[PDB]
Amino acid sequence: KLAVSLQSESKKRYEARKRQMQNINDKNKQFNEKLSRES
């Protein structure tokens, strides 16, 4: 149950971060978003 809990929580964290990711180039827009966070 400990192993299953770690696996399932890892899956949940991983998929939540994927859903956040899904909302000129990928790196260039990530840099522009970082600059918008900076301001």
Place this chain on the structure above:
RNA sequence: AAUCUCUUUGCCUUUUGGCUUAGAUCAAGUGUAGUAUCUGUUCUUGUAACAAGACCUCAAUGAGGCUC
């Protein structure tokens, strides 16, 4: 196999990896210095008589059969 999803924060989670004469130039009837080879013609009599792969045994498989 026991919950799942959205917003707002926190984390940045594929989130700019040196230097110098901003390295230099927006460009030249080029000059200069090396390393090679050539290119091309062109090719080597007739007629008659007479004569003639299968199977078996031993065994690294070849020798023998008035054999076919």
